[PDB]
From a paper:
PD-L1 is often overexpressed in different tumors, and its interaction with PD-1 on T cells enables cancer cells to evade T-cell-mediated immune responses. Thus, blocking the PD-1/PD-L1 interaction can restore T-cell activation and antitumor responses. In the present study, we report the crystal structures of the N-terminal IgSF V-set domain of PD-L1 in complex with the Fab fragments of atezolizumab and durvalumab, thereby elucidating the structural basis for the blockade of the PD-1/PD-L1 interaction by these therapeutic antibodies.
The crystal structure of the IgSF V-set domain of human PD-L1 in complex with the atezolizumab Fab fragment was determined at a resolution of 3.10 Å with R/Rfree = 0.208/0.256. PD-L1 and the atezolizumab Fab form a 1:1 complex in the crystal as in solution, and the crystallographic asymmetric unit contained five copies of the complex without any symmetric relationship among them. Superposition of the PD-L1 protein from the five copies in an asymmetric unit showed that the PD-L1 protein and the variable region of atezolizumab exhibited little structural deviation from each other, whereas the constant region swings almost 30° due to the intrinsic flexibility of the Fab elbow. The interaction between atezolizumab and PD-L1 buries a total solvent accessible area of 2,106 Å2, which is larger than the PD-1/PD-L1 interface (1,970 Å2). Most of the buried solvent accessible area is contributed by the heavy chain (67%). The complex structure demonstrates that the interaction between PD-L1 and atezolizumab is mediated largely by residues within the central CC′FG β-sheet of PD-L1 and the heavy chain of atezolizumab. A hydrophobic interaction is also formed between the BC loop and LCDR3, involving PD-L1A51 and PD-L1A52 in the BC loop and lightL92 and lightY93 in atezolizumab. These interactions draw the BC loop toward the antigen-antibody interface, thereby inducing a conformational change in the BC loop of PD-L1 that deviates from its conformation within PD-L1 in apo form or in complex with PD-1 and other anti-PD-L1 antibodies.
Numbering used by the authors:
A (entry chain F): 1 to 132, 139 to 218
B (entry chain A): 18 to 72, 76 to 133
C (entry chain K): 1 to 213
The structure:
């Protein structure tokens, strides 16, 4: 029906730049009212900037004022959030949203993640958490940046019993997480247990075999 | 529904003259001007924008276009364009948000004398 | 700018329950409040607008009430589809502000954690650092107490905890406690113990290991 599709997220330095893109479909872009809303990890929604695409009319939150520039190309049916002089505090998931005229925002994009850090990219180390009824084993995925990672067991063959915990931001400034699975003791020594770790920002793919 | 209405969706006015185009919105009890969002636009231009207590505006429009703000509290956003060039012809887009929001478009033709 | 504060922050209800969330506007916003739903990894879903009215397609079990300062969002019969975080928002004054969070979780019978403890990998000891991991798995409720005993002496500041969202089918939680020491510090000691206190337990539970057996 009505869709908003976002592009251009990623990891950059403080003082660096980016341009987020919002692809508008299914409605008259001429008459609409478009906003950018952002959500920092763990935090709530913060409004950022809005544009009336008909004229050039724009207005910003004092937070990002003078740094972000919001614009629209009517012929491309697209709004752009140009983010300049970024700070680490600007790190969030960025949504573009349509104003629902009676009130609130009716349509949102899926969101695009922007991370701002001095830190360069780092692929994770993976270590087995080995088993010593039912037993439990898993992978410790340590010292990576930025998020996300993604973890799966036995190429997707193992679903139930698996808990892949949320990341934890270490004092080092690098993220670390663990993924565990509960399996019968019967299977130790018989069933092969491999966790599949993808940290895409570093293009790191690891498959670690877990065993006593 | 919060509805912006306009008296005339088509204005015809001769050059060198003046014109006041209007957008009327309902005024709620105890209207706080700081909450009132108003902008007037032609295509690709911002004629005037009144937000967060007072007035991005296009190159051509000061010395020319002013919002009459003394009528705001009573629920009329009135864009007054003095000396009227033929540059001022086009579709004007009126928009008001106090809480809820709505918009209206208005056509302006300008004839030489 | 207007604060929107929501309350409660966390709420545990059951399918079929009546749920009431309230939002308090810092100043009078009139009817300009709206309500949203959000599930993890997903964008906000518009539920209520103008403090009262229902958005198209939103089940009639969602209601909203108020004007001025105080606002309520009410779910008549809580559906399994409805466990999420709910946001009130005011669009009257710039900037449009969001009340941040009300999390509706799913109530459930008390369940005791299965507790596991993993000593560091030898691959990881290559690296000069040491991570001891404690697994509290499939328990309810979310509140749990994990103590790291090294030396048989309690530890602080060196461990970090992480919790899952409520499990798909059994609605339970799982928790990881990772204890961090240097390869030096790790080898300096003896025995490593993980002590768990949880409501579903007869008494505190300790799982332990001696270095390399």
């Amino acid at each position: 029906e009505v869709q908003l599709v976002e592009s251009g997220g990623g990891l950059v330095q403080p003082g660096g730049s980016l341009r987020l893109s919002c692809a508008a479909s299914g409605f008259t872009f001429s008459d609409s009212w478009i906003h950018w809303v952002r959500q920092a990890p763990g935090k709530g929604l913060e409004w950022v900037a809005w544009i009336s695409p008909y004229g050039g009319s724009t207005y910003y939150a004092d937070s990002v004022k003078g740094r972000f520039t919001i614009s629209a190309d009517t012929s491309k049916n697209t709004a752009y959030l140009q983010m300049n002089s970024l700070r680490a505090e600007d790190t969030a998931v960025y949504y573009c949203a349509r104003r629902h005229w009676p009130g609130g925002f009716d349509y949102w994009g899926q969101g695009t993640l922007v991370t701002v850090s001095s830190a360069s990219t780092k692929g994770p180390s993976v270590f087995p958490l080995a088993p010593s009824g039912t037993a439990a084993l898993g992978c410790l995925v340590k010292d990576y940046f930025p998020e996300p990672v993604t973890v799966s067991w036995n190429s997707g063959a193992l679903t139930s019993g698996v808990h892949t915990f949320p990341a934890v931001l270490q004092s080092s400034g690098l993220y670390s997480l663990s993924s565990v699975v509960t399996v019968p003791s019967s299977s130790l020594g018989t069933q092969t247990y491999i966790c599949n770790v993808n940290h895409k920002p570093s293009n790191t793919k690891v498959d670690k075999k877990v065993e006593p | 529904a919060f509805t912006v209405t306009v008296p005339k969706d088509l204005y015809v006015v001769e050059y060198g003259s003046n014109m006041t185009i209007e957008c009327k919105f309902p005024v709620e009890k105890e209207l706080d001007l700081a909450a009132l969002i108003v902008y007037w636009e032609m295509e690709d231009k911002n004629i005037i924008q009144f937000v967060h207590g007072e007035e991005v505006q296009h190159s051509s429009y000061r010395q020319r276009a002013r919002l009459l703000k003394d009528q705001l509290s009573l629920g009329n956003a009135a864009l007054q364009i003095t000396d009227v060039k033929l540059q001022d012809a086009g579709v004007y887009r009126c928009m008001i948000s106090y809480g809820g929001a709505d918009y209206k478009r208005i056509t302006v033709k300008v004839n030489a004398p | 700018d207007i604060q929107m504060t929501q309350s409660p922050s966390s709420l545990s209800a059951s399918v079929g329950d009546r749920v009431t969330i309230t939002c308090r506007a810092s100043q009078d916003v009139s009817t300009a409040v709206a309500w949203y739903q959000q599930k993890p990894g997903k964008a906000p879903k518009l539920l209520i607008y103008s403090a009262s009215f229902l958005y198209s397609g939103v089940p009639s079990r969602f209601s909203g009430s108020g004007s001025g300062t105080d606002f309520t969002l009410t779910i008549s019969s809580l559906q399994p589809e409805d466990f999420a975080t709910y946001y009130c928002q005011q669009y009257l004054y710039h900037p449009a502000t969001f009340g941040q969070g009300t999390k509706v979780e799913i109530k459930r019978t008390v369940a005791a954690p299965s507790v596991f403890i993993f000593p560091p990998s030898d691959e990881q000891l290559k690296s000069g650092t040491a991570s001891v991991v404690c697994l509290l798995n499939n328990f309810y409720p979310r509140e749990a107490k994990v103590q790291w005993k090294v030396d048989n002496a309690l530890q602080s500041g060196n461990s970090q905890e992480s919790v899952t969202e409520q499990d798909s089918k059994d609605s339970t939680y799982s928790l990881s406690s990772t204890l961090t020491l240097s390869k030096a510090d790790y080898e300096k000691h003896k025995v490593y113990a993980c002590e768990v206190t949880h409501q579903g337990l007869s008494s505190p539970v300790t799982k332990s290991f001696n270095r390399g057996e």
